[PDB]
Amino acid sequence: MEHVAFGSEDIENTLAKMDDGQLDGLAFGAIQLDGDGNILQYNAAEGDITGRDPKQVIGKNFFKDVAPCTDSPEFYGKFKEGVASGNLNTMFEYTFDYQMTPTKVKVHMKKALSGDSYWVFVKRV
Numbered sequence: 001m002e003h004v005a006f007g008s009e010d011i012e013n014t015l016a017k018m019d020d021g022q023l024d025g026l027a028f029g030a031i032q033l034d035g036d037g038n039i040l041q042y043n044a045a046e047g048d049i050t051g052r053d054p055k056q057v058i059g060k061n062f063f064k065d066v067a068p069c070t071d072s073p074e075f076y077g078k079f080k081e082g083v084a085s086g087n088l089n090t091m092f093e094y095t096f097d098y099q100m101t102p103t104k105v106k107v108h109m110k111k112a113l114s115g116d117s118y119w120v121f122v123k124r125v
């Protein structure tokens with residue numbers, strides 16, 4: 001396992017050194033996005049929540065294609081305001097119900113170390 005705690009204060013620094021393989025070792029769901037909503041990375045722990053197959057979503061748009069539930073001021077509204085402001089760091093509970101059993105999660109969104117990339121972290125509550 002990759003020993004990194006969900007919500008860590010320097011998680012962006014840590015996850016910068018990892019590759020596709022290493023991100024599969026985390027105890028929580030991790031998704032990388034560009035500033036538009038396209039998925040750049042998707043770890044196996046996230047797949048173990050949504051029934052989604054990582055390889056088949058990478059390149060698709062999160063808010064438009066993959067996960068319509070997040071297309072809301074409560075989720076997508078925060079992302080866009082962060083992508084706009086040049087900073088994002090927020091944690092909240094959400095429910096995923098698209099093509100899946102309604103599942104309650106804790107979500108964490110934080111700007112990455114790179115310029116136009118954002119992290120979405122998911123865990124069960």
Ligand SMILES: *C(=O)/C=C\c1ccc(O)cc1
Nearest residue numbers: 050067069070096097098
């Ligand atoms: C509503 O958000 C639907 C779905 C969904 C699919 C994949 C991931 O990673 C989160 C949420």
